[PDB]
Amino acid sequence: SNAALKAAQEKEVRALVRDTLVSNPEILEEAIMALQTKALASEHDALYNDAASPRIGAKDAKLVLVSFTDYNCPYCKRFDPLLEKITEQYPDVAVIIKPLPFKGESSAKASQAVLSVWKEDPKAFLALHQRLMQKKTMLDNASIEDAMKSTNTSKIKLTDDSLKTLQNNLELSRKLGIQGTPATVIGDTILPGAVDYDQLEIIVKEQLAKV
Amino acid sequence: SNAALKAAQEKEVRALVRDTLVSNPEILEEAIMALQTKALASEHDALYNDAASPRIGAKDAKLVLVSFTDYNCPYCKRFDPLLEKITEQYPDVAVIIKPLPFKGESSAKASQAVLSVWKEDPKAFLALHQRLMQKKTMLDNASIEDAMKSTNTSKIKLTDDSLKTLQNNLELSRKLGIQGTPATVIGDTILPGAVDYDQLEIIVKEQLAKV
Amino acid sequence: SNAALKAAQEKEVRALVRDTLVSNPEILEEAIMALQTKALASEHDALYNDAASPRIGAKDAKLVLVSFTDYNCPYCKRFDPLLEKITEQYPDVAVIIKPLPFKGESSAKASQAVLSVWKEDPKAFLALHQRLMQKKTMLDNASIEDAMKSTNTSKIKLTDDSLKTLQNNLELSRKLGIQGTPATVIGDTILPGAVDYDQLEIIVKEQLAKV
């Protein structure tokens, strides 16, 4: 006929699609990882070549981690020093910061602050980034203003343009299927959540050995 | 035998389920969209015909957008004026508001406020909705109370019944697979995240041309 | 040849993988549930046998619910009394509490508080757990300190070790595919979101009848 399969065979194939996925649902996980790998490739320039995205470490770094993070995210605050320590112990490693507004208004405001500072004065970014991360309270307008005053960045205006960069980060995180912070792109892998320094150190080395 | 497929063929089919999804994981995306389309159809009356859900624009509107949103969500605040502007420029378009408690306690409180106002005095809803959206701070009990005082709605009690409407919105968002705000139902599409006015304007027109 | 399927049959099978999942996307839901069931089994000891995780009810309980929850989550606050009431009406039912830091810094701080109290003085945990849940405001350092003072637990230090327990809860929630609170493990089911007492009462009975 016009079909290579018999109708009875077609019916069994359809049943086998269900049975295979229900009995071996790990296939779905593998498929999602494959979808993530393709997303990393398609969004590569947004990840690594966005001039508006702050960078910690050498511009000439041979490995670049991409940190999707939130200044109001508790394990982001605790993980960020570990990311920065990698750049200190491994000069060939840099970290790109992708602030996200996940935890609400103050997160967006904080992100707007660091992104505006980065554009106006890149060298001044790190101090504010760190001050916001080490803050032990949920951020608000007053505390963010204090952070900028305390890092000598209070002269720098928060721009509407920086909110577009922030929106790009948000769109990027969605395209990569990231729905939690901290999320860290390391080579072909997206690390979900914080990890201790030794594990991070191992993972970056495994990726350093691939260059 | 009792099988249209040979055992060897069955084995290859199972392998092909995996290989097909891993090599072409876009199939999963298409399947999720199909699942979303079915969800929109099954939850149609909860979406469009819930009297307890506030509406912006004409009751006789031929196109109705459903805005899943959060008063503590930064890009919700910035996107909402665009949704309202559509109803001003396109009188045949209305917007149904589905407040969500995603960003925590104050979000629920704020939602409770607008939903309670809608039930007691529908015409009084819009002012409070707008005041809460334009608020530049993470909401709290005091700021929500100020919003109600500033919109002459402070006489209206927050009801436990409005918390049921809010719970319905939450359950609805889950059934639709919405895990982020703002999410906007436009015809057969669920728009993820905010978009600029011109893009929104194009999308609504494409849907207006289908009526 | 080396293939049980003809090439034309292979092509049709690949097409049928797509068509089956797009026409019957409920298969994906069933597959995810299967993946959840396997996750519950593999993470069983983290769920039920973590000494660092607070328990409400009898240690010798024959049914144990696992409550993934957040002190800044509005419907968590309203659902928790229902979970505790089950343990009062059904002494053979206990509830394990898994605090999560989803809503930000104060959530982590609050979780750190209850987990630190549990380890130092288990009997003192419940009062603080309840006080934090009944709090009508988004928590902050001051309000958390007040909660501890008001429950005679302010002598107990927040430990860095409790932050590891909290991180375990977070990792556990991810492995189980939980991306919202309250999430309640009941036997082989993961209940998403809050439910009224009568429905909860029915579900626990259905699981009680399986022991």
Residue numbers in the entry:
A (entry chain A), B (entry chain A), C (entry chain A): 1 to 38, 50 to 222
From the paper:
Like DsbC, PmScsC is a protein disulfide isomerase with a thioredoxin-fold catalytic domain, redox-active cysteines and a redox-partner membrane protein (PmScsB) that reduces the active-site cysteines. Unlike DsbC, PmScsC is trimeric rather than dimeric. The native PmScsC protomer consists of an N-terminal trimerization stem with an 11-amino-acid flexible linker connected to a C-terminal thioredoxin-fold catalytic domain harbouring a CXXC active site. The region responsible for this conformational flexibility is an 11-amino-acid linker within the trimerization stem of the protein.
PmScsCΔLinker is newly reported here and lacks the 11 amino acids that form the flexible linker. We show that the PmScsCΔLinker variant lacks both disulfide isomerase and dithiol oxidase activities. ­The crystal structure reveals a trimeric arrangement for PmScsCΔLinker, with the catalytic domains closely packed against each other. The regions on either side of the linker region reported to be helical in the three native PmScsC crystal structures are directly connected in PmScsCΔLinker and are also helical. The trimerization stem interactions of PmScsCΔLinker are similar to those observed in the crystal structures of the native enzyme, but all three catalytic motifs are in closer proximity to each other than in any of the native PmScsC crystal structures. Indeed, the crystal structure of PmScsCΔLinker reveals a close association of a positively charged patch near the catalytic motif on the accessible surface of one protomer with a neutral/hydrophobic patch on another. However, it should be noted that PmScsCΔLinker has an additional unanticipated mutation (Asn6Lys) at the N-terminus. In the PmScsCΔLinker crystal structure the side chain of Gln9 adopts the same conformation as in all three native PmScsC structures, but the mutated residue Lys6 does not form an equivalent hydrogen bond to the main chain of Gln9. Removal of the 11-amino-acid flexible linker from PmScsC impacts on the activity of the protein: unlike the native protein, PmScsCΔLinker has no disulfide isomerase activity.
